[PDB]
Design a protein around this ligand. Sequence first.
Ligand SMILES: Oc1cc(Cl)ccc1Oc1ccc(Cl)cc1Cl
Ligand SMILES: [Cl-]
Ligand SMILES: [Cl-]
Ligand SMILES: [Cl-]
Ligand SMILES: [Cl-]
Ligand code: NA
Lengths: 323, 311
Amino acid sequence: HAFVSTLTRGDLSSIRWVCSRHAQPTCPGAQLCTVYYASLNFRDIMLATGKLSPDAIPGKWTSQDSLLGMEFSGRDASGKRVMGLVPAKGLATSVLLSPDFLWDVPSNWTLEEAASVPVVYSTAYYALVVRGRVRPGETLLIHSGSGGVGQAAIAIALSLGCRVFTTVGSAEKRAYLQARFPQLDSTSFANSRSFEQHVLWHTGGKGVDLVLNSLAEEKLQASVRCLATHGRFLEIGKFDLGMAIFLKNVTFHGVLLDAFFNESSADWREVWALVQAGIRDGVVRPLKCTVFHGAQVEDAFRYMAQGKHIGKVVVQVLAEEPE
Amino acid sequence: HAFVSTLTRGDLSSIRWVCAQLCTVYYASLNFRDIMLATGKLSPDAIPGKWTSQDSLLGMEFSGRDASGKRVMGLVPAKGLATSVLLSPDFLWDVPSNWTLEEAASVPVVYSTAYYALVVRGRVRPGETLLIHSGSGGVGQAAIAIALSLGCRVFTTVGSAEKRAYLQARFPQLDSTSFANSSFEQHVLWHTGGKGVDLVLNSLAEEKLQASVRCLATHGRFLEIGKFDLLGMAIFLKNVTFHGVLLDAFFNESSADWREVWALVQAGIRDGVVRPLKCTVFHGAQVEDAFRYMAQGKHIGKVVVQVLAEE
Ligand SMILES: Oc1cc(Cl)ccc1Oc1ccc(Cl)cc1Cl
Ligand SMILES: [Cl-]
Ligand SMILES: [Cl-]
Ligand SMILES: [Cl-]
Ligand SMILES: [Cl-]
Ligand code: NA
């Protein structure tokens, strides 16, 4: 067994593979999977650079545990291709996890790209459907549309018949989204020319019903101004109060999946089912992947941290075998 | 027709009387917003709706009689502190026989607010637990009444022993464990088995947000009533939902949504859940005294201005 860990806490240059046989659990509640690809998420960057303490992550961890890695694709003990969510420790040669957090990988998918799906789509479905309760014909404002969760949210929003507005960091990102999502038109892109004025003008002065991730971009105040009454804010936890909030009867939803691995495990399969149905119906599409050899894991992190990429940064722990 | 107005904006000493369904106002209650307006801490431009510079917005609720003489109580978007109000019948309730008009004037705002916050927004369920800050406050008392009627366990913080004593006497269903600050987070955590509470009401007003999060259950909800005189990772890890609440929208763009709240209040009256607050009454001529006393915030229940004595 081997996992990725920073030698000295907070130093990304000290990152390396620590090597060392984990037993197969008999009980149906736990399962040992072989990791082929492990995706990087922003939290992994926060942990490795020391901006985030592992003591902050919920669960039962020891002082020697490395929590790097939140999602993977690979094979179960029987050799079936799977992808899954893990509370931590995804960046390893094998993962021990509950089968409740596994999905089968569609035959037309590569293992490589399947690794990009679990976190962003589980997060987007939980936020929009379970928490946001999106309804057809409602309007959404998705900040950072080309970002991982943004892309998932756009795909889900459009599938449920919702009208989508988004903000993006660049023309390239705008161009990418327009091509990936032909249902979008030029009016969908709110920050190409302020975004709140744009939204108001294309919502009959009424504003949008839901806003996703305004805090990450520091666009909350502006977002309230183009929010409809009884609007809902959806904000995914990132480890880094005007009167309008009350007059408009605004609701704020703080969102993270960590609880589903713990005290909220009884409510997880609702989210699991949403992802599964989305896969079946073609809504859930793998993101674009930039792949690094596991031996270049440090390079993957530094590349990820720059945040200039589109899609997912994936680490190849074990190359998928030829068919 | 006459209404209360500050002749000079922001000078409470200059306050005086100035000489859909039309109702005669017998009693007009004061709310903190009225104080904010009268003392100039709040601009009338901040209050939604179509008002003119000549309007006085003082007064949010009343009791009296409609045109046909039937005793009523109601919510108004503004202009409640007057000899008459013009309003949609959607914002009127019949006054029960056992109530005086005096005390009926204490009901509309706090119970409409409490029902909308706890039931419509909070979606409180039987067997869930609530932390109600400032339990002796108007909305707090309404919230406690509603929570107990729905089979919820109530925790509350109070400013003094008198307030506890009043609440304990007003609500015999409460016990010693209901009063969390006789630290509340430690008290709450111990009496919820470390699970925390499902709902918290008005932590911001009391400056108890951080501590309230610490004794909040996963998927817990914060309910916060707007006040014009106003983020750890736990917020996200616990999947917290925050509800900002005010009734103003119901008079305007959310009029279609109002009936649910109206019916909740009416039903609460029917089931005897809705009980009038204690009232401290001032004659209309001492309207200034009423404002200054209200501003002291030492009272328990409602401050009410008698515009016209009940026959
Ligand atoms: O004070 C808060 C308390 C909680 Cl539990 C959650 C969010 C809070 O602050 C907010 C409330 C509403 C909106 Cl739309 C945005 C923000 Cl940042
Ligand atoms: Cl993070
Ligand atoms: Cl599309
Ligand atoms: Cl005014
Ligand atoms: Cl009682
Ligand atoms: Na106020």
